[PDB]
Design an enzyme around this catalytic site. Structure first.
Site, PDB file in Angstrom:
ATOM      1  N   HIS A  82      41.766  38.041  30.043  1.00 50.48           N
ATOM      2  CA  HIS A  82      40.809  38.902  30.757  1.00 50.48           C
ATOM      3  C   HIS A  82      40.912  40.378  30.320  1.00 50.48           C
ATOM      4  O   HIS A  82      40.645  41.307  31.098  1.00 50.48           O
ATOM      5  CB  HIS A  82      40.981  38.796  32.278  1.00 50.48           C
ATOM      6  CG  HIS A  82      40.735  37.431  32.841  1.00 50.48           C
ATOM      7  ND1 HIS A  82      39.560  37.095  33.471  1.00 50.48           N
ATOM      8  CD2 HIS A  82      41.530  36.340  32.926  1.00 50.48           C
ATOM      9  CE1 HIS A  82      39.629  35.849  33.899  1.00 50.48           C
ATOM     10  NE2 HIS A  82      40.815  35.370  33.576  1.00 50.48           N
ATOM     11  N   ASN A 122      37.396  33.414  39.488  1.00 48.26           N
ATOM     12  CA  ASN A 122      36.541  33.221  38.308  1.00 48.26           C
ATOM     13  C   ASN A 122      35.139  32.835  38.762  1.00 48.26           C
ATOM     14  O   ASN A 122      34.891  32.707  39.956  1.00 48.26           O
ATOM     15  CB  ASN A 122      37.104  32.133  37.377  1.00 48.26           C
ATOM     16  CG  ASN A 122      38.273  32.603  36.533  1.00 48.26           C
ATOM     17  OD1 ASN A 122      38.538  33.804  36.380  1.00 48.26           O
ATOM     18  ND2 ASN A 122      38.976  31.632  35.942  1.00 48.26           N
ATOM     19  N   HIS A 180      46.542  40.834  41.451  1.00 51.14           N
ATOM     20  CA  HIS A 180      47.513  39.753  41.464  1.00 51.14           C
ATOM     21  C   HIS A 180      47.306  38.900  42.718  1.00 51.14           C
ATOM     22  O   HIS A 180      47.317  39.447  43.830  1.00 51.14           O
ATOM     23  CB  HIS A 180      48.932  40.336  41.442  1.00 51.14           C
ATOM     24  CG  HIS A 180      50.001  39.307  41.567  1.00 51.14           C
ATOM     25  ND1 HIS A 180      50.365  38.513  40.518  1.00 51.14           N
ATOM     26  CD2 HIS A 180      50.770  38.914  42.601  1.00 51.14           C
ATOM     27  CE1 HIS A 180      51.307  37.660  40.887  1.00 51.14           C
ATOM     28  NE2 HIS A 180      51.577  37.897  42.149  1.00 51.14           N
ATOM     29  N   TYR A 229      51.753  37.519  37.681  1.00 50.40           N
ATOM     30  CA  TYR A 229      51.042  38.778  37.773  1.00 50.40           C
ATOM     31  C   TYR A 229      51.913  39.974  38.171  1.00 50.40           C
ATOM     32  O   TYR A 229      51.499  41.111  37.985  1.00 50.40           O
ATOM     33  CB  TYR A 229      49.858  38.697  38.720  1.00 50.40           C
ATOM     34  CG  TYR A 229      48.745  37.743  38.387  1.00 50.40           C
ATOM     35  CD1 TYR A 229      48.950  36.372  38.439  1.00 50.40           C
ATOM     36  CD2 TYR A 229      47.486  38.216  38.054  1.00 50.40           C
ATOM     37  CE1 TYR A 229      47.937  35.488  38.138  1.00 50.40           C
ATOM     38  CE2 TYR A 229      46.458  37.338  37.746  1.00 50.40           C
ATOM     39  CZ  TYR A 229      46.689  35.981  37.798  1.00 50.40           C
ATOM     40  OH  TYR A 229      45.693  35.115  37.503  1.00 50.40           O
TER      41      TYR A 229
HETATM   42  C1  HDD Z   1      50.744  31.387  34.968  1.00 54.07           C
HETATM   43  C2  HDD Z   1      49.923  32.278  34.466  1.00 54.07           C
HETATM   44  C3  HDD Z   1      48.509  32.298  34.856  1.00 54.07           C
HETATM   45  C4  HDD Z   1      47.669  31.232  35.368  1.00 54.07           C
HETATM   46  C5  HDD Z   1      47.984  29.775  35.595  1.00 54.07           C
HETATM   47  C6  HDD Z   1      46.417  31.985  35.630  1.00 54.07           C
HETATM   48  N1  HDD Z   1      46.447  33.307  35.293  1.00 54.07           N
HETATM   49 FE1  HDD Z   1      44.985  34.721  35.664  1.00 54.07          FE
HETATM   50  N2  HDD Z   1      46.116  36.068  34.787  1.00 54.07           N
HETATM   51  C7  HDD Z   1      47.420  35.943  34.378  1.00 54.07           C
HETATM   52  C8  HDD Z   1      48.158  34.818  34.413  1.00 54.07           C
HETATM   53  C9  HDD Z   1      47.695  33.521  34.889  1.00 54.07           C
HETATM   54  C10 HDD Z   1      48.100  37.253  33.957  1.00 54.07           C
HETATM   55  C11 HDD Z   1      48.885  37.087  32.667  1.00 54.07           C
HETATM   56  O1  HDD Z   1      49.131  37.657  34.906  1.00 54.07           O
HETATM   57  C12 HDD Z   1      46.934  38.258  34.002  1.00 54.07           C
HETATM   58  C13 HDD Z   1      46.629  39.040  32.730  1.00 54.07           C
HETATM   59  C14 HDD Z   1      47.160  40.448  32.917  1.00 54.07           C
HETATM   60  C15 HDD Z   1      47.261  40.633  34.397  1.00 54.07           C
HETATM   61  O2  HDD Z   1      47.394  41.710  34.995  1.00 54.07           O
HETATM   62  O3  HDD Z   1      47.199  39.329  34.967  1.00 54.07           O
HETATM   63  C16 HDD Z   1      45.788  37.368  34.486  1.00 54.07           C
HETATM   64  C17 HDD Z   1      44.592  37.913  34.660  1.00 54.07           C
HETATM   65  C18 HDD Z   1      43.488  37.346  35.418  1.00 54.07           C
HETATM   66  C19 HDD Z   1      42.279  38.092  35.781  1.00 54.07           C
HETATM   67  C20 HDD Z   1      41.888  39.484  35.460  1.00 54.07           C
HETATM   68  C21 HDD Z   1      42.236  40.422  36.604  1.00 54.07           C
HETATM   69  C22 HDD Z   1      41.803  41.806  36.169  1.00 54.07           C
HETATM   70  O4  HDD Z   1      40.558  42.017  36.102  1.00 54.07           O
HETATM   71  O5  HDD Z   1      42.692  42.652  35.822  1.00 54.07           O
HETATM   72  C23 HDD Z   1      41.482  37.142  36.546  1.00 54.07           C
HETATM   73  C24 HDD Z   1      40.147  37.333  37.193  1.00 54.07           C
HETATM   74  C25 HDD Z   1      42.327  35.957  36.543  1.00 54.07           C
HETATM   75  N3  HDD Z   1      43.471  36.090  35.848  1.00 54.07           N
HETATM   76  C26 HDD Z   1      41.919  34.751  37.250  1.00 54.07           C
HETATM   77  C27 HDD Z   1      42.617  33.489  37.220  1.00 54.07           C
HETATM   78  C28 HDD Z   1      42.048  32.291  37.871  1.00 54.07           C
HETATM   79  C29 HDD Z   1      40.793  32.180  38.662  1.00 54.07           C
HETATM   80  C30 HDD Z   1      43.037  31.287  37.523  1.00 54.07           C
HETATM   81  C31 HDD Z   1      43.130  29.873  37.931  1.00 54.07           C
HETATM   82  C32 HDD Z   1      42.527  29.441  39.017  1.00 54.07           C
HETATM   83  C33 HDD Z   1      44.054  31.984  36.730  1.00 54.07           C
HETATM   84  N4  HDD Z   1      43.781  33.294  36.555  1.00 54.07           N
HETATM   85  C34 HDD Z   1      45.257  31.339  36.235  1.00 54.07           C
END
Ligand code: HDD
Ligand code: HDD
Ligand code: HDD
Ligand SMILES: [Mg+2]
Ligand SMILES: [Mg+2]
Lengths: 747, 747, 83, 167
Positions: free
Chosen positions: B122, B195, B386, B409
């Protein structure tokens, strides 16, 4: 098809369990052949797997850190074998995840910290390994070891780049391109960090953050990506006429190269060569492409950022996989010290070029890029190039842009690469010895055994030791240039001329290149919201050339004033009005090897046509893509089964150099909108088109009369003459004579 | 033009000297009006300058860190006034730059370290400020303070995003979109991190790096950007049928939204609501767009990544500047604890949706986004969302994807935002009190005065203190869920069903939406190099629906086996074959407000037509862009001077919702290739087209007969009926009935 | 840059000037200041070239280095007077 | 890898002149120096380490499948770090404190770290309290005193209120 009915091995909850085991197809079709193959023939692969036989001393030195995979257990980073890489540890199979799951946490932690800061500028880039060799010893003019002996092979690593956009931006933007070469010499790393134009936008490094901020996405909303076509850029340009020279280059087709293989490279700055007797010679560095100079046209380049934003990265990689190695000749413009003040421009002014008509480029050596990296992040993203990385036999000058660069490229790595040990990252390591008294820092790899971490020392008999300067293998000593002046923040008056080099460039262009420059300015300024900025830029153009200024003004609905019509043109450059070396196309160069042709198939192709086409292309090293309305295979009139590379929409005309339509069942594609559009788009973009037999019916869609026209090859069959004609057109790159016909084509 | 002949104030070496002083035009045309204005009317601006009177408690709390500029001296970061920001300090004006130039080094140092790591996923996103209010108190089901009172306003900050591409990648890619909302509540920050589809690709967080690595650019060459259309993605999908449900959504037009305003949002996971009596209710979160659901078509979306890679970012910013605020209704699907096992699917399985036909979405509140940020980097790039950031009244479930998210997060911010004090970055700060015994860490802003940095303590009378749980303003306590099970790395058997939800989705789509899904799969799989991967994916489709599988196979030249033709379809979902809420278009919704129409001008426009057009559009809140073959002005038949917004090429049909051509001197544009192409492209992409008077001659270029067709509005003049017809077409978004006609159009 | 985590160390409260500070520098790790200037460069017209250079003067003027005369060759050499 | 001729002087315009920005040798050397330090360990910052080896007396296969304990023919290299707890990396050795005793075993089936102390119990029962306990024993936050000592108010305040610490 018997052999093309592969079913997935996983239809049930075995997909959520350990032991999926072997998943490759039994026919081995997952594995690319480790031999040279044309673009699209095989999946691309890491360089050491695609071309293991291609070696050099730097590539060999990386073997210590290369990691395999086949026949190894999946482990944690601590070497613990993993039994189940499909599931987290939970209290019950519908329970909460447990904090004691160290396997999960290690894997997610590493993922969570994968990204490092991108480069402040030139974030988007593509790189390859190769080697350099000089043609003869240059010991008369430089003591640089890598130029001392024609049998001396120096490994290189080269990164080509755009400037403005992020690492995830598109390749075929309008921008300057970077051309950075790391030479792994026996006397140290030399980085030649250049661009694809011979000058820069600004004179003094103090302005670099201002210029870069102006061209980058605007700070409120972070728009636009990969584009100078916005208010802040043209605001700065309008207020800083020193920028106009490189702006002219950017607005020309120089700003949209066909390939990194088909552009020039320049060090920009005047540097010095120092010989064993201590004599300094001024030098400017050039790279001349063996493939010649060639560029896209704007509508094509822009649309290609959508259809394939990785086009240049892809083309570079695939050329190397095909054995079609990018080659560039290193060249020097050499100026004796006593000639420093013989030109109309200051040699130290990076907004001024040295015309080849005044000072020829002397060929020095050749560089060949012959292997792709294994891991993009480890080798490309983490590579650190810096123009302060020189070797004995080279030195700087007081060019005030260069001078500030020397500070920046060391400084920036501290955040980008996480500390002062960035030279220990494998791609950055010298292949020659390096020893000193520096210690510690984040991620220190080298374990020093020296009892001393200081000099002078007695406890290690003062090792490692200084080396006096000398003809070979000596220490670095700066040329003892005489400095006389007061401490001032002041631009040299000799730099205060802004219009003559833009005019020289303009007058060196062909008429169609001039049209493209006009259209570049017009398109970009049309996206500037504040009209006064457009008007101020048009006013600057009037100080360069009135024809240019009037043509741009007309496209913007601007009227020049009487005073603007009477602006005195700037002077010649040491008696020169023009220099044809500044044009992409005035002097024919290069060749068709490595270019690509789309072949538009139908469901019963005339095999005789296709055979003749492919034989002729292969003889000249030109690649082909067989395109159709679907994937799979079609069968030719003689029963030959033809595999389809891509659909018309999947590999648009943007991605090829020419289009050929063989005969057969033309009715199959005659009313296909995508096939007709394929030809219209290629036609609009000035590409050669060849039509055999009933394919000549397509002349109607491109509004070409029965009698034909130059640039459209046609015959009863492809067995001429036909292919010679098409290949001759390809050697000329584009059909410039067609330009007046394209305005009426809706494409 | 008298007032449109602005000349640059700088033509000489004054440009290289201090004291350039005032450079704004005397007419004040540099400054945008601080009032709502339609897209393109004014330059865009930081939110606090564009809309200073739009306020909320979070926006007001940022005033402490906002920095102005007007009437201030240019200084170093230490507050030292700079005299000359054009030059480095050198020994003589052609001399070497001096190390003592601290002004240069500070400025370059800051520049050299501007970049921070992008988000792992993202990375590409666009954000705005707004507010939320509930419709009624939800105290019966949750003690969450922000849902307790309809008059309680909660500020929000929302970031929309793609998933795969870098921060510099394009907006209108085919991808899932993120929809993340930070609620600044009186009892803590609540981040709803969702999402635009109701499920995810994978079941257990342990697989997240595998899935993400598969979809991301491949590791050898870092291709392709912003695309799932490559071997490794489809390899993973073929081997992990759990992915098929979200793949179906991605291959549908859901994957290419028209705007962030015209997509749904989903929390995906089942969470809990906890009331004051300790009762838990299962909940899934929904956002319903007031503007309705609407998507692009693939050819349009792909080309738009080239013509305007910032299209969604731009449209969001400009809607807010127009006063056309994005609005979304928050909705809850509520399931009692005793109904946990009522459905065919496991409530904890994030690859399964809860059909609205089984569990309705109950409207809870409304969110309005009404101000843009001031600085993209400071507010958008540094924002940290987060899903572990919950508040009393909410709780988690054992969804094994959610469970692992809770780790990630927090962890990821340590590298991305430089340490553990990321909550002190202004955008991330709570607006409610925050006090604890945590200390130090990089870039610590808060200066703690507590004598104690531990508890229990006597020396500060044990402050700050724990708070017991309670109905309001109480401490956080987890719901005491009963856990019974062995410590296992094991997927629940209840999760082991992969095909019924994909089939439910498929059967819920209109026939044209089904075509678009088929074409999505077909396009993407055609770019997979290894044919067996294509075949394995087609095999998976045959387990979902044979019509789908056969259609994709046909486009790939693949033949299904007799066994594949006899695969038993998956079961209904609790008796449902389809659910029309899963279609973008089956149930008409939304509003033309905020849409945009291209008006193709000529050099003597019929003013009566244009006035009628503009008045009718304005009445419905639809914007217009006046386009021509050049910039500047044209004059209408009645002498009205019309300013031109863009050229036909500068603002292609891709960027608008409909095209209108008024009468006048149609001969001026009738043979203009760009004007004809404008209509062909809009026609191909199913957009409404309206043609007045002699503009009806353009029917020839789109192959429409004299008698006309649905979707082409025509009349002698742009009368009442004409505009009503056009606006009715716009309310239906696209002309789906035209689909059979577009295959023959070369565009 | 390593000790205090990036180029915004002047924004750490103890390091902040008490007098005004404004310029065109942006971003960097842990950026606290939220800039509202339409321009992040100079010279600019879009913010009428603010913030602006200040000429040197007796009070409240810009910094200018003393114009010391420098005469010598570029050398890595200790002054004999230091020996 | 560039040989240095003069490691005694900066490059200047004249031997009594200003130092030049183009002195890349100076800047590389000073840059590396300027970034030598990394964060010390939050606890156990003061420590001393050595290499060695471990060998079992007999196979323990009846009670563990750990490879490094499977046969007296397994010689396992180790790296051991001993430490204090409270004081910084530059604090003194012979303070009154708990000592750390950490052993990294480089086994054929992975790294095993046995991360212990020189007493058989710890001060606290639940990890959630670790920052509270550590903050209490560490130098007090106003003035950062005292180093390497539990002999101050905050430590004994915590102990007095948390009898679990008494052992
Ligand atoms: C185990 C790790 C993992 C899993 C299974 C997911 N994500 Fe995630 N997501 C992250 C690890 C992550 C992250 C690595 O922690 C991010 C990227 C950088 C951040 O700040 O968070 C992230 C970013 C991130 C963002 C952007 C937030 C922003 O605008 O800064 C959104 C909207 C989502 N995720 C949504 C989801 C949804 C709807 C998931 C499943 C239902 C999902 N993620 C599963
Ligand atoms: C005062 C600062 C400054 C100035 C005046 C320039 N640059 Fe630069 N350049 C940088 C500061 C910088 C940098 C910030 O240090 C970069 C980005 C990150 C990095 O490693 O170097 C960089 C990157 C960079 C790269 C990418 C190297 C790579 O592939 O990693 C190239 C090719 C150039 N530059 C070329 C030039 C040329 C030809 C210039 C003028 C003639 C120029 N730069 C002026
Ligand atoms: C919840 C946090 C926490 C808790 C409850 C403990 N520790 Fe710990 N310990 C850490 C958090 C930590 C740490 C912050 O992670 C350290 C400092 C930096 C590092 O690398 O680990 C650490 C370092 C550390 C070291 C130094 C290792 C080295 O030489 O690098 C030893 C010997 C111990 N610890 C031993 C223990 C023992 C015997 C404990 C209780 C029985 C204990 N720790 C509880
Ligand atoms: Mg076999
Ligand atoms: Mg004051």
């Amino acid at each position: 098809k018997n052999p093309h009915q592969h079913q997935s091995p996983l239809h049930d909850s075995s997909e959520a369990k350990p032991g999926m085991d072997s998943l490759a197809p039994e026919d081995g079709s997952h594995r690319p052949a480790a031999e040279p193959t044309p673009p699209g023939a095989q999946p691309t692969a890491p360089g050491s797997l695609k071309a293991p036989d291609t070696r050099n001393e730097k590539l060999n030195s990386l073997e210590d850190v290369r990691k395999g995979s086949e026949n190894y257990a999946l482990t944690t980073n601590q070497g613990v074998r993993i039994a189940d890489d499909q599931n987290s540890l939970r209290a019950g199979d519908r329970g909460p995840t447990l904090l004691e799951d160290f396997i999960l946490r290690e894997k997610i932690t590493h993922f969570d910290h994968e990204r490092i800061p991108e480069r402040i500028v030139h974030a988007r880039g593509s790189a390859a390994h190769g080697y350099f060799q000089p043609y003869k010893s240059l010991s008369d003019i430089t003591k640089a070891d890598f130029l001392s002996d024609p049998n001396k092979i120096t490994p290189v690593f080269v990164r080509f780049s755009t400037v403005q956009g992020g690492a995830g931006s598109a390749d075929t933007v309008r921008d300057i391109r970077g051309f950075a070469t790391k030479f792994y010499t026996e006397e140290g790393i030399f980085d030649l960090v250049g661009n694809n134009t011979p000058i820069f936008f600004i004179q003094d490094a103090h302005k670099f953050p201002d210029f870069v901020h102006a061209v980058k996405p605007e700070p409120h909303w972070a728009i636009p990506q990969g584009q100078s076509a916005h208010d802040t850029f043209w605001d700065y340009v309008s207020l800083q006429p020193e920028t106009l020279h490189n702006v002219m280059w950017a607005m020309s087709d120089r700003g949209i190269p066909r390939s990194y293989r088909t552009m020039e490279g320049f060090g920009i700055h005047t540097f010095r060569l120092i010989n064993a007797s201590g004599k300094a010679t001024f030098v400017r560095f050039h790279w001349k492409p063996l493939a010649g100079k060639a560029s896209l046209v704007w509508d094509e380049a822009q649309k290609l950022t959508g259809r394939d934003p990785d086009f240049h990265r892809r083309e570079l990689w695939e050329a190397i996989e095909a054995g079609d190695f990018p080659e560039y000749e290193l060249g020097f413009q050499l100026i004796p010290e006593e000639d420093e003040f013989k030109f109309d421009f200051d040699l130290l002014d990076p907004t001024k070029l040295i015309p080849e008509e005044l000072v020829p480029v002397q060929r020095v050596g050749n560089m060949v890029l012959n292997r792709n990296p294994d891991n993009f992040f480890a080798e490309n993203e983490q590579a650190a190039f810096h123009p302060g990385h020189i070797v004995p036999g080279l030195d700087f000058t007081n060019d005030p842009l260069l001078q500030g660069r020397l500070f920046s490229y060391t400084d920036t790595q501290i955040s980008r690469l996480g500390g002062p040990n960035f030279h220990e990252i494998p791609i950055n390591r010298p292949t020659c010895p390096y020893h000193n008294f520096q210690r510690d820092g984040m991620h220190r790899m080298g374990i020093d055994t020296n009892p001393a971490n200081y000099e002078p020392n007695s406890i290690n008999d003062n090792w490692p030791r200084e080396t006096p300067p000398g003809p070979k293998r000596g220490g670095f000593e700066s040329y003892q240039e005489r400095v006389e002046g007061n401490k001032v923040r002041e631009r040299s008056p000799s730099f205060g001329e802004y219009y003559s080099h833009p005019r020289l460039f303009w007058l060196s262009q062909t008429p169609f290149e001039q049209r493209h420059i006009v259209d570049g300015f017009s398109f970009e300024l049309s996206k500037v919201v504040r009209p006064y900025i457009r008007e101020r830029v048009v006013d600057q153009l009037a100080h360069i050339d009135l024809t240019l200024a009037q043509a741009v003004a007309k496209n913007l609905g601007i009227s020049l004033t009487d005073d603007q019509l009477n602006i005195t043109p700037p002077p010649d450059v040491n008696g020169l009005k023009k220099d044809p070396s500044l044009s992409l196309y005035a002097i024919p160069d290069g060749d068709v090897k490595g270019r690509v042709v789309a072949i538009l198939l139908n469901d019963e192709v005339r095999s005789a046509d296709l055979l003749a086409i492919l034989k002729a292309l292969k003889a000249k090293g030109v690649h082909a893509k067989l395109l159709y309305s679907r994937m799979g295979e079609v069968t030719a009139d003689d029963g030959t089964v033809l595999p389809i590379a891509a659909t018309f929409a999947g590999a648009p005309s943007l991605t090829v150099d020419a289009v050929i339509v063989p005969c057969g069942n033309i009715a199959d594609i005659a009313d296909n909108g995508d096939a007709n559009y394929y030809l219209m788009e290629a036609y609009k973009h000035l590409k050669p088109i060849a039509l055999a037999g009933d394919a000549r019916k397509f002349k109607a869609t491109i509004k070409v009369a029965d009698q034909g026209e130059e640039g459209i090859v046609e015959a009863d069959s492809a067995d001429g003459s036909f292919m010679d004609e098409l290949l001759t057109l390809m050697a000329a790159h584009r059909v410039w004579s067609r330009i007046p016909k394209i305005d009426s084509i809706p494409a």
